[PDB]
Design a protein around this ligand. Sequence first.
Ligand SMILES: *C(=O)[C@@H](NC(=O)/C(=N/OC)c1ccco1)[C@@H]1NC(C(=O)O)=C(C)CS1
Length: 247
Amino acid sequence: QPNLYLSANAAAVYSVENGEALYEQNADKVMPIASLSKLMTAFLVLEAVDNNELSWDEKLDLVRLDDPSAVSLYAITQKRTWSVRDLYSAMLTMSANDAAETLGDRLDGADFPKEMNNQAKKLGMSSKTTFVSASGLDVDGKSAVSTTKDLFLLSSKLISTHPEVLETTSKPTVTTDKGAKLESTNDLLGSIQGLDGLKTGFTDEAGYCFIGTAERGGKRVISIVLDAGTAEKRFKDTEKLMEVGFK
Ligand SMILES: *C(=O)[C@@H](NC(=O)/C(=N/OC)c1ccco1)[C@@H]1NC(C(=O)O)=C(C)CS1
């Protein structure tokens, strides 16, 4: 494998076709993942719509977060009622934590972390993965953790099961029906040709994290960057991983 000099502590890029690694650094090491948890929440929201168990047009009131300081749709808008569609978009574009928690609570109430971990097992993720909340916020001091290998398995399963997820994560801005603008945290959209996802994350413990995905000519790759040093460097790391991915 090539000799990359990444900011990330743990990183890898995989070809979706055979699931095989084109670069791996610390790909078995258990890492905090933070807002990357929202990809499991998206999967379960998309499953519930397909199962005739949830409506895109259902109106829900945002749940209140124990810390009013965290990134939240409510603080940006002063608007409490939102459709499932817009909460889903907010979760994936700007990483609104209260959107993610409102969706998880609607799906399974208090038991939603159990459902995330049940589904982690069904998707082939190892027992090193632990989800604690729909948003990736710590609960009872407990943090969501995984590995780049398990994160790949979740990502590729999300994309092959619900390809329409990329219709949301490929957009630099999502405008809801009523005109609210939801700006994506993925600053590489429009910079790498073929890049259409997937999810950012950051906490002090997790560092700056990003799962990316791009397809050129039938070939899809998924890159995972964990614990980069700055908000810009997880993207510079991704640029290097995409270059290896399409070599
Ligand atoms: C997901 O990781 C989420 N992070 C936080 O809400 C958060 N938690 O700290 C305990 C935090 C602290 C400082 C900034 O966020 C979203 N992560 C990011 C990002 O990927 O950079 C943004 C832009 C929205 S919050």
